[PDB]
Ligand binder design. Structure first.
Ligand SMILES: *[C@@H]1O[C@H](CO)[C@@H](O[C@@H]2O[C@H](CO)[C@@H](O[C@@H]3O[C@H](CO[C@H]4O[C@H](CO)[C@@H](O)[C@H](O)[C@@H]4O)[C@@H](O)[C@H](O[C@H]4O[C@H](CO)[C@@H](O)[C@H](O)[C@@H]4O[C@H]4O[C@H](CO)[C@@H](O)[C@H](O)[C@@H]4O[C@H]4O[C@H](CO)[C@@H](O)[C@H](O)[C@@H]4O)[C@@H]3O)[C@H](O)[C@H]2NC(C)=O)[C@H](O)[C@H]1NC(C)=O
Ligand SMILES: *[C@@H]1O[C@H](CO)[C@@H](O[C@@H]2O[C@H](CO)[C@@H](O[C@@H]3O[C@H](CO[C@H]4O[C@H](CO)[C@@H](O)[C@H](O)[C@@H]4O)[C@@H](O)[C@H](O[C@H]4O[C@H](CO)[C@@H](O)[C@H](O)[C@@H]4O[C@H]4O[C@H](CO)[C@@H](O)[C@H](O)[C@@H]4O[C@H]4O[C@H](CO)[C@@H](O)[C@H](O)[C@@H]4O)[C@@H]3O)[C@H](O)[C@H]2NC(C)=O)[C@H](O)[C@H]1NC(C)=O
Ligand SMILES: *[C@@H]1O[C@H](CO)[C@@H](O[C@@H]2O[C@H](CO)[C@@H](O[C@@H]3O[C@H](CO[C@H]4O[C@H](CO)[C@@H](O)[C@H](O)[C@@H]4O)[C@@H](O)[C@H](O[C@H]4O[C@H](CO)[C@@H](O)[C@H](O)[C@@H]4O[C@H]4O[C@H](CO)[C@@H](O)[C@H](O)[C@@H]4O[C@H]4O[C@H](CO)[C@@H](O)[C@H](O)[C@@H]4O)[C@@H]3O)[C@H](O)[C@H]2NC(C)=O)[C@H](O)[C@H]1NC(C)=O
Ligand SMILES: *[C@@H]1O[C@H](CO)[C@@H](O[C@@H]2O[C@H](CO)[C@@H](O[C@@H]3O[C@H](CO[C@H]4O[C@H](CO)[C@@H](O)[C@H](O)[C@@H]4O)[C@@H](O)[C@H](O[C@H]4O[C@H](CO)[C@@H](O)[C@H](O)[C@@H]4O[C@H]4O[C@H](CO)[C@@H](O)[C@H](O)[C@@H]4O[C@H]4O[C@H](CO)[C@@H](O)[C@H](O)[C@@H]4O)[C@@H]3O)[C@H](O)[C@H]2NC(C)=O)[C@H](O)[C@H]1NC(C)=O
Ligand code: 49A
Ligand code: 49A
Ligand code: 49A
Ligand code: 49A
Ligand code: NAG
Ligand code: NAG
Ligand code: NAG
Ligand code: NAG
Ligand code: NAG
Ligand code: CA
Ligand code: CA
Ligand code: CA
Ligand code: CA
Ligand code: CA
Lengths: 388, 388, 388, 388
């Protein structure tokens, strides 16, 4: 119809309610479920769907052997109905590649997939299910993007890309697309020192992205974008409640404009909702591995270097496997505010469970409630022994 | 379009004709059919579908082991095309949880799923396929609801919930929703002493629910709701033709305002159509187990404590397994009256058939005819031996 | 939109071209294909689909054992996309039962399914996918109907039913439905002595049905219906080219008003297009079994007792299994005439191939061409050995 | 809506970007994927889909044995969603046969399938999913057509057919269809000596087809059609960069009006985009077998007998199997030019991999970019060993 505008603010988050869960690995033990990873959720004006990068094989298939690998010619961004598992028969391919993002601008959807060898990758930007623009690697070192939805405002949909080292300075760019065409791009600015896999959301004409500093930071870098002026800033979440993984133990004071030290060259895609006292941070419970997942209300986390939790909610027990997490919202819902949502990737198989030769995941997703709801934990639920 | 109003009365029920049957267990012996239980049927203005609580695994899958359990994080309310089986590929998830209800108000559908641990469950009310309202447990003891469709009148859709003991007084509430929002709720009133799993239908601006008194009654409690005044009353079916299970043998006089004694702390979801002489009661044939199913015309059953059958129809032989049963009607059909319909859950597996490690069911459904049709019996049809 | 009227005459049939083929048994050897029998084809104004009576199990499933049986509670009329096989995941249930017919009147579709025990069967007439009318058995001996599509004219859709003996006089009725309601019914009249499984088509406001005289005739009875006056006549195809099966060898002169003798109490559903010199008869090649299938142009077959073939086309070799056959046409196609079409059921399994415990079929369908096209044979194509 | 007119010219091809890939053989190792061959891609105004000739069996099915054979009664033209694999459950049958073409004219789609024995084949032309016209074999020797999409201009859709010898002069005809009806046909004219499997595209009211001279040429014949005058010309690509397979090594000067000698009675379906300096040729890397695939920019290839490459892009490594290739474009995309696209059939199984008894393929497809994108290779990806 008309382009969507981020006219609302976030609803007050007093707890999180279950939104979707596909139990993909449980079901796929005996049905034609595709092996995936790097999942996310994204809404169209009339439907919300699950998204992920297929590995081009079913979990029970012999080709599932080796799916711990990230980039192959057999991967593709697929989407499927909310809470259903990604099956061979219900998965819709959005584009071919091993790194992606996708978002609806109110009129139609833009999907981006990057493919190619490490030194010669390229992004293809699809709009209205047709390829429109292509961007060649600029640093010749794994051109890569968000792995979760982008956000649009009056037709302008910013996307964060990184090309270059994962263990030193890299070349991050913010591209501003409209109808799949490049309006402008700019190099990363601000104090964030390394950027990977940004998780974004929008409210009141501003887009906030919480990313991953793979090089040095255990606190997460934050990029705030003005989609009208097509400009941005960057910094780190100030709070001493560290949210990357692996990470050192939480200190009493964090860092606002530099990576909090202790862990180098590693991390995990994550997210946050930074809205004054209505601020909630997601993180794995373990400081060593992708185990467990919790949401912590940390008032003013972005700007207060001593901010600590005032409330929380466990999503996945520390005795269960988690993984990537990111933000999304249904910008086309009723009401006066945008309801914050997120998903957690529940990785099964390698490297943590190496009795099987594959790596896959299932999805759990939650949205905020203004009520203070009781909590439950949401594990993947599959028994690896069954796959032996 | 416009909200549906219960403007018609029930058609005269002279017999029951076959409406739908999915043969799910037979088919699922060699196809990707999801394990389910607590099924029902519900219509939209342009389509009627089967509904149930999936267990998040196929019947042949190794994860089917243990599906006798009621509440897990792997359950979800799913719907699928009438008379097709609930497969991985055709089942649409309405919401996540282990207790549910759903109904269309003429404009769109409201679905409710409750999830969480026993002492911290919560209901999430979805409208137009989006989460709108959440309600936290008030008694911290398995918040639970109907397990069959709710009914709407001019946008108001009442739903009966119970939180608390299953073997003593509990806290039952009647919530009046409109567009997924709470207009009002009220505590159960009247003489019904315990309420669980209400089966409802509407006619001439009144909604009648036949429920399960798990604590003490072998006769069934009845809640009648005025969706305009948003008020209700409750009592028990007076008739000595007892319809819960297990239950004592039928006496010559029943009880109108108290549970008929003889069996405690157990029961089965059931239903009835209470319309003067046009009154029909459903029940298992066995007084000891969920075996067989029959419909009995018992004129004035609700108000006459000595009422006995004047006609009947066998639905499932006593030599076949039955289970839950509930009411639904196609409020959008042509004609001058609403045609009464019902479904019977045909449970297979545990605990009655323990050679297999799973518990599931198939569905059979019938609607009324003004003709006096010949009768057939409708068993699940699967051979457990095939699953060994 | 508006009710369809049979305003066109038949196109000139100079040969038959391939229209559809599902290769169901071949494909189902390794996919979730439902066991079926009694198939047919029927068009809606915007789509033509395959129809059949499912047996409520896949072919590879253990429940396929015993599917030679005709009437069980696990059967249902299903439809699916043209030339695709009837799978668990793409088959749409139209109604429950073991005998059926279905047709579109231009506005919506009417489907009829009969179910029940031999002495207490009933038909349920569905219109716009909702049950509207029910008819109880009148002779208490396997109420049964066409097993191929009915035909409508200005909303009136006649259907032929038989109740009673299959080996002596029975009670055949012609019901005239409009919007699923009974306008009128009448007992069979004319000289046809026994009627079963009528195959019908319409042209120029007249509906012609070629049926099966199971009791005594090897020539086929013909019922011609006037859907406006709602009246009919009946006789037999006069031609000595006999078309039932089993049957005696072809004589030089046939019978116009009595069954041609030689074979009793058996037969097969079949069809014909009776249009003066543009007359074509279908039949099995074998006079003893459901083997092979050919189309023969027999000018004036209906009225000329000495009529013999002037042209022909082999459809299935005598070395391949055939079965039921019936007529259908796309009444919503472009052009000035209706193109005659037919399907042949290719039965596999029991009783002819008893190394397997099941009975099923695939479908082949053809339509007429005004060209004189080269011919090919169209067998089922599956290797029974693969199923052992 | 309105008939599409070829009003645009080709976009400048500076490189090729990944468009679609189904990984059919990898996925089908453990899912119900149909065996196919002779694939292509074709767009409708609102969707682009994959097309191919099914063999009427799954790859894992026992009936996959023998699928190296080209013409059987179990083949059909099927289409399915872009980049999904051709499964039993998502494949839509367009028509029955073993040779085909299909194209959308802007209003609806025309599909053509040829079937029958070698000496009595016939084509059936479908329009708006209904059979409209039939054409009988004129040379009684494998009537056959394009195996890739046709192209339309103002309702007129030319199609190239060949009937007769594959190793000597044959009878090629160009048929001009409109709404599935024959407007005109004409015998092949010009200097092309043998024509098979034309790959076509349109721009600025002209349709260009690059075909296969199976008899003598290793250079490819080219037919250029004027769809308004309904006339055509034919010649060969002049360039010494030979593009059929098998073929002799590249010479320094080619042949414009005669087959370049060296290899007889064999070839492979292929394609090219002939647009002055914006000319790109596709070909297998191997001169001996269907191994590898590359795109070569050969300015003025059509008219310059000494033209050599100025740029190139590898699509499939010479160490991987390729096969048929053809052209298609999305004539309904936005922008001022038509973006050239192509697909490559990746054949797996027999005859090159005879450890398995089947022959099938997967699909990879690319479209042009005005950027100079980095290149990757795109193999089928399946491990034959897994199928043993
Ligand atoms: C029914 O459901 C309801 C609703 O969910 C349940 O009630 C919920 O209960 C939760 C558990 O108690 C509770 O969550 C906690 O909230 C705390 C904040 O509230 C408290 O503090 C404020 C501040 O003054 C008070 O106002 C308030 O009244 C409370 O006292 C959080 O602090 C909790 O998080 C911390 O603990 C958990 C372990 O439980 C850690 O996993 C988490 O990371 C936090 O602790 C780590 O981090 C801090 C910050 O740096 C450190 O100080 C601390 O030492 C920990 O650090 C170690 O561990 C981390 C992670 O491994 C590691 O990185 C680091 O290096 C260190 O090793 C927690 O979020 C909900 O708020 C509450 N909700 C409501 C509405 O009441 C109810 O119980 C249920 N009922 C039943 C019967 O079950
Ligand atoms: C073709 O199809 C037609 C259509 O279906 C078939 O005709 C149908 O036939 C049915 C079977 O006969 C018949 O159903 C019965 O109707 C009885 C009512 O009709 C009779 O009574 C009235 C009243 O005066 C008369 O007007 C009428 O003419 C009849 O005489 C019911 O009473 C029957 O139900 C009772 O019997 C069955 C066993 O058959 C029980 O399962 C059922 O629960 C009822 O009996 C129990 O309950 C009562 C009430 O408390 C007790 O009094 C009784 O002792 C039983 O109690 C024990 O069992 C229960 C359950 O296990 C347990 O809880 C309790 O503790 C005790 O242990 C029955 O419904 C249809 O009405 C009739 N329909 C028509 C239109 O005619 C026809 O036969 C078919 N043709 C062929 C050739 O097959
Ligand atoms: C390329 O394709 C084209 C197009 O298909 C092929 O050409 C077609 O060729 C067909 C085969 O020759 C041909 O079909 C036959 O047509 C005959 C009619 O045409 C002839 O007669 C007329 C009449 O005077 C002439 O005008 C005309 O020129 C011809 O001479 C039919 O009579 C044929 O049917 C009979 O034979 C077949 C066996 O082939 C039987 O199966 C069939 O049932 C018919 O015979 C039985 O029935 C009659 C009637 O009672 C009896 O008289 C006879 O004895 C048989 O009875 C026994 O068998 C039956 C069945 O088992 C049993 O019930 C009974 O009791 C007895 O035991 C046949 O239909 C097409 O018309 C022709 N089409 C065209 C357009 O030309 C061409 O060949 C192909 N090219 C190549 C190179 O292959
Ligand atoms: C990141 O990605 C980019 C983008 O893809 C990569 O850059 C690309 O690199 C490609 C490989 O170098 C390059 O492709 C080649 O282009 C050549 C044309 O460019 C050159 O010549 C012109 C002309 O003067 C110059 O202007 C230009 O600057 C270059 O020097 C082609 O000639 C190449 O094709 C030939 O070689 C390949 C083998 O590599 C053959 O497979 C191919 O068939 C061509 O050679 C055969 O055919 C010719 C013509 O007859 C014969 O002369 C020759 O002897 C060969 O013949 C034998 O082999 C054939 C086939 O088997 C057989 O039939 C025959 O009988 C003989 O046996 C090739 O296409 C891209 O243009 C370039 N793109 C860009 C934008 O730069 C970059 O490398 C990547 N980066 C990294 C770090 O990897
Ligand atoms: C493009 C790509 O390969 N992305 C991969 C990403 C990067 O390796 C990381 O961001 C360091 N640069 O890591 C992970 C991961 O689970 O940690 C998964 C992604 N598939
Ligand atoms: C929420 C929940 O668990 N409901 C379960 C219900 C209750 O246990 C019963 O109503 C006693 N309170 O029992 C049964 C049952 O087959 O009997 C199935 C339901 N899954
Ligand atoms: C209602 C029913 O059972 N119809 C069956 C029909 C009758 O038995 C026959 O018409 C004799 N009355 O026979 C056959 C058959 O293959 O011959 C199949 C049908 N399923
Ligand atoms: C109609 C038909 O059979 N076409 C086949 C075609 C012809 O044999 C060739 O064009 C020589 N005439 O060859 C091939 C092939 O892979 O080479 C596949 C096609 N299925
Ligand atoms: C978003 O804002 C622009 C005004 O700049 C307007 O064009 C558009 O209609 C707005 N979108 C909606 C849904 O109102
Ligand atoms: C139901 O009743 C209300 C009048 O209160 C009206 O708004 C609505 O239109 C009615 N619904 C229909 C379908 O007529
Ligand atoms: C069929 O005929 C009746 C006239 O009796 C008319 O109502 C109807 O419109 C006709 N149908 C069509 C499609 O014209
Ligand atoms: C194509 O051209 C013809 C004019 O001959 C016109 O009828 C038609 O509208 C044109 N198509 C479009 C999409 O404009
Ligand atoms: C495939 O077919 C050939 C030819 O009939 C036969 O020899 C071979 O054994 C078959 N292989 C399988 C696996 O069926
Ligand atoms: Ca880090
Ligand atoms: Ca009870
Ligand atoms: Ca399987
Ligand atoms: Ca007979
Ligand atoms: Ca050649």
């Amino acid at each position: 119809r008309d382009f969507n505008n981020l006219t609302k603010g976030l609803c007050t988050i007093n707890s999180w309610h279950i939104y979707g869960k596909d139990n993909a690995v449980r079901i796929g033990e005996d049905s034609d479920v595709l092996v995936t990873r790097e999942p996310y959720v994204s809404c169209d004006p009339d439907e919300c769907r699950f998204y992920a990068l297929s590995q081009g094989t079913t979990i029970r298939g012999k080709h599932s052997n080796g799916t711990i690998h990230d980039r192959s010619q057999y991967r593709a961004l697929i989407s499927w109905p909310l809470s259903s598992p990604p099956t061979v028969y219900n998965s819709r391919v959005e584009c071919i590649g091993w790194s992606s993002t996708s978002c609806h601008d109110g009129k139609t959807r833009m999907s981006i997939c990057i493919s190619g060898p490490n030194n010669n990758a390229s992004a293809v930007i699809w709009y209205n299910r047709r390829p429109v623009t292509e961007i060649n690697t600029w640093a010749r070192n794994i051109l890569r993007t968000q792995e979760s939805e982008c956000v649009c405002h009056n037709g302008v949909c910013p996307v964060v890309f990184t090309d270059g080292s994962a263990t030193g300075p890299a070349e991050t760019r913010i591209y501003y697309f409209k109808e799949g065409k490049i309006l402008k791009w700019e190099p990363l600015a601000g104090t964030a020192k390394h950027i990977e896999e940004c998780s974004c959301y929008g409210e009141r004409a501003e887009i906030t992205c919480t990313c991953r500093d793979n090089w040095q930071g255990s606190n997460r870098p934050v990029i705030r974008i003005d989609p009208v002026a097509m400009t941005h800033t960057s910094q780190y979440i100030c709070s001493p409640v560290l949210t990357d993984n692996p990470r050192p133990n939480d200190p009493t004071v964090g860092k606002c404009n530099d990576p909090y030290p202790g862990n180098n060259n590693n991390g995990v895609k994550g997210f946050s909702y930074l809205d004054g006292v209505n601020t909630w941070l997601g993180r794995t419970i373990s400081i060593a591995s992708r185990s467990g997942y919790e949401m912590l209300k940390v008032p003013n986390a972005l700007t207060d270097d001593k901010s600590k939790p005032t409330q929380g909610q466990t999503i996945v027990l520390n005795t269960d496997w988690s993984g990537y997490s990111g933000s999304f919202m249904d910008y086309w819902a009723e009401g006066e505010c945008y309801r914050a949502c997120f998903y957690v990737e529940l990785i099964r198989g390698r490297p943590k469970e190496d009795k099987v030769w594959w790596t896959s995941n299932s999805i759990v997703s939650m949205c905020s409630s203004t009520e203070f709801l009781g909590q439950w934990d949401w594990p993947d639920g599959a028994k690896i022994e069954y796959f032996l």
